[PDB]
């Protein structure tokens, strides 16, 4: 890799490329009793990917509540393993840019 800012831009490109390759993308935001659920459904060929991020609303602001969930009718174990690793790597890249600034 290059600089922390360049490594973050590459991860942004990989994330965007995932949603561009999807045939359709449907989003849903649900909230109830300080619990917020962010669901994105990707249509990829005949199958589907369901991405679920859950957050707890503390002091009116969203706070991360667990890692992202990847659910599929086939077996997104490997895809979910890459997506869950991509999420954690995407978070460290932002951390390193923020520590620099």
């Amino acid at each position: 890799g290059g600089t922390p800012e360049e490594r973050l831009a590459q991860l942004e490109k990989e994330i965007q490329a995932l949603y561009d390759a999807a045939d359709e993308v449907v989003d849903e935001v649900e909230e109830k009793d300080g619990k917020m659920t962010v669901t994105r459904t990707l249509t990829i060929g005949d199958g589907t990917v369901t991405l679920v991020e859950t957050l707890k609303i503390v002091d009116g602001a969203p706070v991360k509540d667990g890692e992202i969930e990847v659910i599929c009718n086939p077996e997104c174990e490997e895809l979910g393993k890459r997506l869950k690793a991509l999420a954690k790597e995407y978070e460290k890249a932002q951390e390193e840019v923020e520590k620099a600034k």
């Binding site: 993308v25 989003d27 994105r40 602001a61 991360k64 991509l86 995407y90 978070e91 932002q94």
Partner: protein, 60 residues
């Protein structure tokens, strides 16, 4: 610091400890705010959510 609220056209004079404005959107829809107001620390963006933070009046 005054930050725009999720319901326009209202703003909020931030209390002590919240020196940032933030807007929360889905990664594909930057023009549809999900959360919007004062905050202390900028949340890190995720695979589905993008956070934009700023520190001037009504910037979010």
């Amino acid at each position: 610091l005054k930050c725009n609220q999720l319901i326009p056209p209202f703003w909020k004079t931030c209390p002590k400890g919240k020196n940032l404005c933030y807007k929360m959107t889905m990664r594909a829809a930057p023009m549809v705010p999900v959360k919007r107001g004062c905050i202390d620390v900028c949340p890190k963006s995720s695979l589905l959510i993008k956070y934009m933070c700023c520190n001037t009046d009504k910037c979010n």
